[PDB]
Write a protein that binds this ligand. Structure first.
Ligand SMILES: COC1=C2C[C@@H](C)C[C@H](OC)[C@H](O)[C@H](C)/C=C(\C)[C@@H](OC(N)=O)[C@@H](OC)/C=C\C=C(/C)C(=O)NC(=C(c3ccccc3)C1=O)C2=O
Ligand SMILES: COC1=C2C[C@@H](C)C[C@H](OC)[C@H](O)[C@H](C)/C=C(\C)[C@@H](OC(N)=O)[C@@H](OC)/C=C\C=C(/C)C(=O)NC(=C(c3ccccc3)C1=O)C2=O
Ligand code: NI
Ligand code: NI
Ligand code: NI
Ligand code: NI
Ligand code: NI
Lengths: 213, 213
């Protein structure tokens, strides 16, 4: 039960410009995804001030980062507001984003890639380190869906019958490039968070697998 | 798409006798589940000697233990052979087990609960620490299914559309009793494994969540 959608043309250009013209300061992808997780968490918390029951699907407010080294995947999960199917479709690629063209012109003129979050398109920085991404999301107002893109001209949206149930929120599942596997490392992850994601109102958890011996 | 099955009557008696008459040496449940995981791993590995492609669904052979403290759940996962739907139904409760009545008589006479694995029913030791269990399993020869029981007279078997895809093998998902939450602790888990599960041919991984600060 799987639909395909074409990306708005500037978004496709944006993604190409990120994958192919940007060389450094890649670690900023993690600040941007932590900022997005934090924005989603702010929104469910604010929503719950006048509708406490919204929190019941998942009472704990957190960000959690799960390196999956054998799969070469990094997951960034939040228990924020989540996105409905129509929200994944409208906001993750089909509709013109304010910022998209403006950001690409600032980049052309010499702007540091890190300014991407200030243009409201910092989601697409994930393509600095990942050649495939799934956004698995569960809004209180919809079923769990999977949005997926390999940075081509199109993305798919699919009713989620394959992943763990999230009570509420989003998993960013990044299929890292072979040159960017340092973001599977516990120490590298902690460093980038401590240096660049210093003021976050929510706990940030790191899931570590160790061998018992 | 969810079927209910009655437990064979001695199995129901066994489970009651475990929950209600046994007081100590509870930690043996972990040795038994590690032994079962190890038996499942031996079987896929042996199967693959003459059918290498069996391993392709999940090339890594491991046991992994994931404490889920906010859910009061402990999961024990293996990438062994897994069980088909008909295997969950036949082997986990509907058919008479050799050992069941014999074990219950040995227990009555004073046998230590730890002898349960020697009677071939050591699976049911999980009821020392858990009041609910899901066995989520994926055999190469079937779809993923969920078997579930709260130790009543019946269990359910359900096509799995809610949990993460396992490539191949089994997750024991234990809903721990409130008095047995020590088995959520990293140090307690390591101790019981080091003391009682010393000779295991497969890596045993422990998944730990820490806050980054
Ligand atoms: C306004 O809002 C925004 C946006 C638009 C939209 C998309 C939003 C959305 O809707 C549905 C929502 O609200 C959400 C909450 C989302 C978010 C942030 C997220 O996530 C999560 N984790 O959940 C995301 O990711 C997936 C999506 C998108 C993003 C983007 C595109 C960007 O980059 N930015 C932004 C953003 C940002 C910027 C900066 C920082 C952060 C974020 C924002 O805020 C926006 O857009
Ligand atoms: C013969 O075989 C057995 C049994 C019977 C059956 C059930 C088996 C089965 O079938 C399907 C299979 O083969 C598998 C491999 C399984 C197993 C072990 C497992 O797991 C896993 N992890 O996977 C289990 O759990 C879920 C199941 C069951 C168990 C039981 C009941 C017991 O206790 N024991 C045994 C057992 C044991 C004993 C001792 C130690 C370990 C195990 C065994 O071995 C048996 O039975
Ligand atoms: Ni690098
Ligand atoms: Ni830095
Ligand atoms: Ni279906
Ligand atoms: Ni105790
Ligand atoms: Ni002991």
């Amino acid at each position: 039960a799987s639909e395909t959608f074409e990306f708005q043309a500037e978004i496709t250009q944006l993604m190409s410009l990120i994958i192919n013209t940007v060389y450094s300061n890649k670690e900023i992808f993690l600040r941007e995804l932590i900022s997005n997780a934090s924005d989603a968490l702010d929104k469910i918390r604010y929503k719950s001030l006048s509708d406490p029951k919204q929190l019941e699907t998942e009472p704990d407010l957190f960000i959690r980062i799960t390196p999956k080294p054998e799969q070469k995947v990094l997951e960034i999960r939040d228990s924020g507001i989540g996105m409905t199917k129509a929200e994944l479709i409208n906001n993750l690629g089909t509709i013109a984003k304010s910022g998209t063209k403006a950001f690409m012109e600032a980049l052309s003129a010499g702007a540091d890639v890190s300014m991407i979050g200030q243009f409201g398109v910092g989601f697409y920085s994930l393509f600095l380190v990942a050649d495939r991404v799934q956004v698995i999301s569960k809004s209180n107002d919809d079923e769990q869906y999977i949005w997926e893109s390999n940075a081509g001209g199109s993305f798919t949206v699919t009713l989620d019958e394959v992943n763990e149930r999230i009570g509420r929120g989003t998993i960013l599942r990044l299929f890292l490039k072979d040159d960017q596997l340092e973001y599977l490392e516990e120490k590298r992850i902690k460093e980038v968070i401590k240096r660049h994601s210093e003021f976050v109102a929510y706990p940030i958890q790191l899931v570590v697998t160790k061998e018992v011996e």
